Amino acid sequence: MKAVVQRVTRASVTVGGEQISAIGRGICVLLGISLEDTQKELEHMVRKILNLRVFEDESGKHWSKSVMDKQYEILCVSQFTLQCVLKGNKPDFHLAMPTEQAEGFYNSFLEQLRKTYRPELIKDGKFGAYMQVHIQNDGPVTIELESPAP
Amino acid sequence: MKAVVQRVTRASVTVGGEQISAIGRGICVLLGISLEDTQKELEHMVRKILNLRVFEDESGKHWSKSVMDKQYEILCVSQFTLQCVLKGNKPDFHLAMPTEQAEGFYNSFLEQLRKTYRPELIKDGKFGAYMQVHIQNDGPVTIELESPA
Ligand SMILES: [Mg+2]
Ligand SMILES: [Mg+2]
């Protein structure tokens, strides 16, 4: 499992100009699920996202508070392209989990996130859809996470 | 050297509320200079970014065309937070090149991009600054790139 995490002042997902979801301050997670991914990686990745210290405290010290410390929001979007192998210049996605299983895995992942944090502060894209993910990256701050190695 | 590349329908940078840079369709590249990066990694990374096949052809075939094939734009922003977290739950900076040496590499990287592609299609943020980077990720499509190893 891989994730790209971007700290946002706001973020939203549109499908065909229709706004699907939107968050204010918090974190946008692009989530790459691999073929070899299991419940262990699912649970480990949730813990890492929720505990990632990307926010300031009241004094303004950097890297001192997680999304949960701040009671901020999380926008998760499924992103199989992160499971890319770069032989030549064309991407190959053989390491990504196929969409039939991946949708179930993704849904279970979002559900662990909601039960570990607060459901109302967790927003999603639309798994199969051609989306525009509007990301107002605050800083910018961008962190790569991986769980096969936690 | 590490990069996160996002395919965009548009992207922009604001500092202090003012939009200082914007592109239309293309890629937004967040670039992380590492401690032992050389001109070698820099040249390799430019090449990879410029030929990355993240665009469709004119028949709609996925993964077939690069930014240059499409004559699309590139917004490049410096981002030192791309190094591995490994231990703890905060960004890790010990592997990032100190800002002083890094700024020279970053500017060299932009000059290489411009020389190898089209200068008028290349935009950047503002190296020192606290930026809002507005990214309309198209798909979304996101690719992680890395040189040395
Ligand atoms: Mg993200
Ligand atoms: Mg990017």
UniProtKB/Swiss-Prot annotation, chain A:
PTM comment: Preferentially phosphorylated in cells arrested early in S phase. Phosphorylation in the C-terminus weakens the interaction with CDC45.
Subcellular location, principal: nucleus
Major enzyme class: hydrolase
Tissue: Expressed in many adult and fetal tissues. Highest levels in testis, ovary, spleen and in adult and fetal brain.
Protein keywords: Cytoplasm, DNA replication, DNA-binding, Hydrolase, Magnesium, Metal-binding, Nucleus, Phosphoprotein, RNA-binding, tRNA-binding
Cell compartment(s), UniProt: Nucleus; Cytoplasm
Catalytic activity: glycyl-tRNA(Ala) + H2O = tRNA(Ala) + glycine + H(+); a D-aminoacyl-tRNA + H2O = a tRNA + a D-alpha-amino acid + H(+)
UniProt-listed Enzyme Commission number(s): 3.1.1.96
Motif (Gly-cisPro motif, important for rejection of L-amino acids): 139-140
A single Gene Ontology CC term: mitochondrion
GO molecular function terms noted in the UniProt entry: D-tyrosyl-tRNA(Tyr) deacylase activity; DNA binding; metal ion binding; tRNA binding
Binding site for Mg(2+): 4, 6, 28
Assembly description: Homodimer. Interacts with CDC45 and TOPBP1.
Family stated for the protein in its record: Belongs to the DTD family.
UniProt function note: Possible ATPase involved in DNA replication, may facilitate loading of CDC45 onto pre-replication complexes.
Notes on the domains: A Gly-cisPro motif from one monomer fits into the active site of the other monomer to allow specific chiral rejection of L-amino acids.
Entry protein name: D-aminoacyl-tRNA deacylase 1
Parent-record interval covered: 1 to 150 of 209
